[PDB]
From a paper:
The calcium calmodulin protein kinase II ([name]) is a multi-subunit ring assembly with a central hub formed by the association domains. Linkers with variable length and sequence between isoforms and developmental splice variants, connect each AD with a peripheral kinase domain (KD).
In order to determine activation-independent effects, we engineered a [name]β holoenzyme construct with alanine substitutions at both activation (T287) and inhibitory (T306.T307) phosphorylation sites, the βT287.306-307A holoenzyme. The [name] substitution blocks activation and aids R attachment to the KD core, while the T306-307A substitutions countered the dissociation reported for human α hubs by the addition of R peptides phosphorylated at these sites. We obtained three cryo-EM reconstructions from the engineered β holoenzyme sample: a 14-mer (3.0 Å resolution), a 12-mer open ring (3.5 Å resolution), and a close 12-mer (8.4 Å resolution). The open ring structure is the first near-atomic resolution structure of an intermediate [name] hub assembly. It has 12 ADs but a diameter similar to the 14-mer ring. The ADs adjacent to the opening are blurred in the top view 2D class averages with lower local resolutions. We utilized the 3D-flex refinement algorithm for analysis of the motion in the open 12-mer cryo-EM dataset. The analysis indicated that the dominant collective motions are the enlargement of the gap by 5–10 Å due to weakened LCs between the adjacent ADs.
Numbering used by the authors:
A (entry chain B), B (entry chain I), C (entry chain N), D (entry chain D), E (entry chain K), F (entry chain G), ...: 408 to 542
Amino acid sequence: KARKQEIIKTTEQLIEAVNNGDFEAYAKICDPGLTSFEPEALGNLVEGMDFHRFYFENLLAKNSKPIHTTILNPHVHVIGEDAACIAYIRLTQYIDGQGRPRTSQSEETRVWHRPDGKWQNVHFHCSGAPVAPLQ
Amino acid sequence: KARKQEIIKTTEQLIEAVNNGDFEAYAKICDPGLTSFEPEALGNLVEGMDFHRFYFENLLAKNSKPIHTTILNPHVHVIGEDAACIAYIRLTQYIDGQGRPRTSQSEETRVWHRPDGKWQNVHFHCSGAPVAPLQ
Amino acid sequence: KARKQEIIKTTEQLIEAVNNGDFEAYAKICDPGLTSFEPEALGNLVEGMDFHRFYFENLLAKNSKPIHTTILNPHVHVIGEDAACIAYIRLTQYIDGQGRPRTSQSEETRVWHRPDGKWQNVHFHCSGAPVAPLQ
Amino acid sequence: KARKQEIIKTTEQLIEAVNNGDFEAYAKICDPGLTSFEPEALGNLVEGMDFHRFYFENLLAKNSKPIHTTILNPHVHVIGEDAACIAYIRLTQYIDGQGRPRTSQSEETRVWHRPDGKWQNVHFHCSGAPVAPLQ
Amino acid sequence: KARKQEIIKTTEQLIEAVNNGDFEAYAKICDPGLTSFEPEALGNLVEGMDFHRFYFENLLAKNSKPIHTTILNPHVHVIGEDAACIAYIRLTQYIDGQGRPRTSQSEETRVWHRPDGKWQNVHFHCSGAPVAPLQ
Amino acid sequence: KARKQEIIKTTEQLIEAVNNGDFEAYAKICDPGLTSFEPEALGNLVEGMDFHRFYFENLLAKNSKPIHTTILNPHVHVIGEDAACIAYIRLTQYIDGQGRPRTSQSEETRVWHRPDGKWQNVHFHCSGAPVAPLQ
Amino acid sequence: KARKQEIIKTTEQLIEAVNNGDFEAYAKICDPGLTSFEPEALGNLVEGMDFHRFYFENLLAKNSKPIHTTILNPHVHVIGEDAACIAYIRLTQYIDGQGRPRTSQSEETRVWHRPDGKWQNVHFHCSGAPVAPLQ
Amino acid sequence: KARKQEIIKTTEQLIEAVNNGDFEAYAKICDPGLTSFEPEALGNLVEGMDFHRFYFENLLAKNSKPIHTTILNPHVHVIGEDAACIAYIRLTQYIDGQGRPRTSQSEETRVWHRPDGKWQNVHFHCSGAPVAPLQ
Amino acid sequence: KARKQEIIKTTEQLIEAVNNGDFEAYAKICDPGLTSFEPEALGNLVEGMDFHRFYFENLLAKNSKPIHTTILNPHVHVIGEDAACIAYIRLTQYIDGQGRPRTSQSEETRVWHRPDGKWQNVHFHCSGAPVAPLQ
Amino acid sequence: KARKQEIIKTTEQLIEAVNNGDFEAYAKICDPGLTSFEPEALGNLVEGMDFHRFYFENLLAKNSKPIHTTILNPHVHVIGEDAACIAYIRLTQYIDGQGRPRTSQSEETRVWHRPDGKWQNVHFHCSGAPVAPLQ
Amino acid sequence: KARKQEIIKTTEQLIEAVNNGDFEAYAKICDPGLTSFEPEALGNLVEGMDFHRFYFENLLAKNSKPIHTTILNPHVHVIGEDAACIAYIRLTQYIDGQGRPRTSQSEETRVWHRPDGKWQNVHFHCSGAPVAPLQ
Amino acid sequence: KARKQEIIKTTEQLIEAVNNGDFEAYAKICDPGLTSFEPEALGNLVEGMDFHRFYFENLLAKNSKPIHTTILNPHVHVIGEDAACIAYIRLTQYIDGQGRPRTSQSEETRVWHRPDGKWQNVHFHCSGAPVAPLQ
């Protein structure tokens, strides 16, 4: 029951890092063997860090607008000493190009591995809208 | 090599059972704590086996019309000893109500746990089209 | 903590009783001075029991077609010692007129009162889709 | 009978404070454990104050264009000594972007609780249009 | 304040009489010099009692299906000692030709005069949907 | 019999003042406890004078386009000595925002009371087009 | 004056013949050099005016199933002292083919020559919607 | 003969005064007691020339383009020494804001009066185009 | 030189075989390890004979209507002694379900291998419209 | 053996040159008078490397912009000893002129031959899109 | 077979002349009676060479930069000993006024005659696809 | 001079024969080695009579609706002794789907050869609208 919290704490740290656009923190946690599905990939399974490395240098470079992100009803499933999974729903708020505020919803999955006592992410699934809000 | 093979073996068997409509085989493999994302849930994190039992007794009792399911390029990780993850793309061939062939795509994720003796599925995630064709 | 339980138990009983069309049972939980917003009222605050009595002779009596009701993540506030407020989301499954499955979502609110050693309902707010299934 | 009045007076104060785009007065009433269903939440249940704070910083107070708010036929229950619920309809008048008058209708619910000599809100349900009018 | 109750009681009696198709009861209260607006006149100010006699032999002779009538928030003015005005909303519940229920809304006005110790109706104005339900 | 004329004289002045855009005249004739049905109320029953003050300040006061109004075949009932009911039809000819002439129809009802020796309106009904000009 | 009533009575007599619905009576009233037109006649303007015959057939074919009639707000001009012009708006109520009651409207222009026992007409233009505006 | 000619001549004079906007002559030909059915009104019996005046003062101030008209199939009959009927189809020729060739059409009636030796029109029936078209 | 001929004959024979649905011949020429791009694959590389087997077993077998083909400007290379490539443009004629005439266009590439003295196709690449006829 | 790594070096070298304006690499690998399918010619079978020479030397050697190329699950067949066939899917990452990142999907094919030991590509086929993306 | 090639080169030089001052030589080589019809002519007889250059002028108006063109699968007949006709398809690669690469396709015909031992073009005909909407 | 006449006469005979769908006659005039361009070929150099044979069974066989064909501004070149060229304008009239005649224009160019003592067509280049009428 204690581990669940630190798993959720780690997930929050990861989401915060990607939002702030620090490639260093993302690289530290993400296992180079990471595999992910995103709408950015047009529905093709993608592997490796290089694919995401592009966005940290040209997309989030403009991440200056006011946004807010909420995490709803996280569910953590424990399957072993160094294995765990987490699922949750994600709500984000932002301001569109018309000056109005907008909201979007997306559900996500992540699988965590602990080699050498340190958690790392080895999978990622995003459904619905793209991670970056549409404006 | 060996373990990566049989994870695919079980996944193939599970996909076969759901297509055939056999409730017992699906019940055996699936873990009691199973969660799921899928379009049938309108974006909610459904849990348990009660929700899916509705479909088996009513809709999938018939598999008359032709259908062909294919799995392309599976990727499997092994976590620790008794945990693994599998990601793959699925192609479904079916005939529509107008009697013409039609193909649909969907990418899916799964997390497998083996407590002591039998592999079991604890989480699921289907993005895009539903688990069955739109006939 | 136990108080938060019997409320959810009662709410589950009331929803079950409505789905079975047994008006007699529904007349005990509900306080005579009931009020409610629901789509059937066209956005007007209805009061009393006579309004709902109509449905319990023609429509809900014929409520025999297969259906499944799910309650997701209820939340309860305990006010004072003899009152409470509960909110939740509701998922319904039904077979439409085309022989296909469907799902509908609607959130709800309820206020419970405890005079005379029993729990009773004194308000009800339903958004989104109608309470009854759309077969 | 007097207690049935100050609840209405308090509700009017809260609506005015929201309309003026002031946050300090808003916090002094709303309970820290507030929950609410609003269209801005896309049908989910949102807890806490942090979610609403975003709106008060970018949208409400920026223009304050001419508008009028009307409350019709409030209905109030008195539960115990420190609990009450209120239901009402709300008509709003505003000028659209085309320079023409418009109207919009919505119904709302609230639950009040008074620990330590102060009425405080713990639940809020809004159907139809959201709290903010569609200008 | 005493007069208001009897006026409302009279109005309810009148609505009951028309529903049951008793022309004699309708005539006993309504003043012979009655005018009325309603969709049945296509927007023409009708006058006299002959026009409405047509409905009490061919329209209500056919329709006998179950129906329920509700009256909401009646308001009454007193502008003398033998004259009064009443305004209210009305909701009707009826079953259409598909074997399913539906609701209709209309708002109405009436003017009452009291010659010979008896209240009499002199005007009527049904807005929105017509007086009768559309099955 | 002459009273049937002065009522029409007052009604004509009331409509003229409404069209012109001055608020003082409308206030004097209209009783403070005035009710009203009109499309701008979205089918609800409004009370008081403030609901219209918004219209006068923004739209009517700024009316600067040619339009025409006519009254066809009024009917007047005299009840008591200080009360009477008037019904009539209203054809409005207006130059639209496109600088083109167009016609629309609407029927109305008004109830008149004369305390202290001045006639005043206590109730108002309108159908079809809105009370305000359709420019 | 009195002669205004006489023409009114004769108009009812013409109506009486119309319910009988015999074309010979129609020919009797019409002057052999009468005029009439309508676009539904493709603008044809002849004494026969078969377009009148067209909706004479449709309307009067209903008479096997009972009908009722009504007229409103007649207006009369006496030409010199030897001819009379009469106009009005006519309401008719009928049972349709589906068994539902109906109402129909028809404006009318008629002119009658003084000579007693030989009254005849030179013109008529039903116009408006002689049969049905929009079904 | 001479009679029938001058009515037609007058008929044209009336038409020219319309297009030229010579209201004073139009007022001279038309009896102040004129009455008319025409689509400009929604089936009502307008009285006087004020309703038509709108189609002269504020319309012709900007509605002025080279325009022509053709009179088709006149047919007249005489009644007594001061009464007669004239019926005619009218074409109006001008190009609107579309490249398609254009020719509008109207068909009309007049009933004629000669008090004191000067002819005048007392009743007027129409259909199709208004007194003046859009430009 | 003749080698560039026989290859073209083989490709023409293959096209005829698939047109007539002779599964055996198609299997004989097609290598067991065939790859393929085509519109039906939604841009996914599909290997083996099972994927195409669906068309023969379901559609082509039942389909008995005729078909005709046009092949334009083939270019063939020569590599080694058991390899070759062919590129060309294609135009095809057939009959639909309604029987009305239908002609299709496609542009296709193929690669051939000749081990064991028998020419066999190991790769294929279509474009544009679907390979299968649209009946 | 070691063919998959062979294509890695060979295909990488070809792709790198393609993304650059140099023609030496393109000329050396390609085969003179070779057909190739690219949407640049609308399936006109661009013959000879000279077609690509014109654009690469003159225009396409523009200023580079941040772009990224990806290759997914390539498949290789080895024909005889001096030939091979390769298929794969190419995802292109680029930033459009609006300043927003974008991705595109396009599948390809290539046939390789070893003339006198050194490898040479004697065919090329691009589907879905051309070699280069559009900004 | 040689005579089939000389025609091609004569045409190849002639086509290249369009891009140089040799266009006058192209004019000189052709019969002064040279004539052609073009898709956009719709009755405008042209000298053949002029209209084709006019297309080239349009491209150079946008381009005014160096050009490359290609000719594919030429077809040449042999008629008599002093006549011949050629058919071919032409592609042009150019840089647009926006600086981006572009391509165009054309279909051409030419008639050749050799009096006095000099090949003279006596009839030309081009073909493109400039459909009117939006190019 | 006389040689010019027969060229036009034969072309008329071929065109008329084309209109009548008499494929056998068309097969005689046209040389077996016919080359042609046309919209149906999508800008491709078709060869042989097989492609054209299709139209003479489905489309040209049903050519029974009224049609009119005209020849304008014919011009003929005489090359050598057994060759000649013909160019002209073409106008076709036909009844469209709306039942209104339509006019279409199309320009051609042909080359005739005279072996065996008879004229035959060895080229054809149609532009603009298709050969067949667009009914």
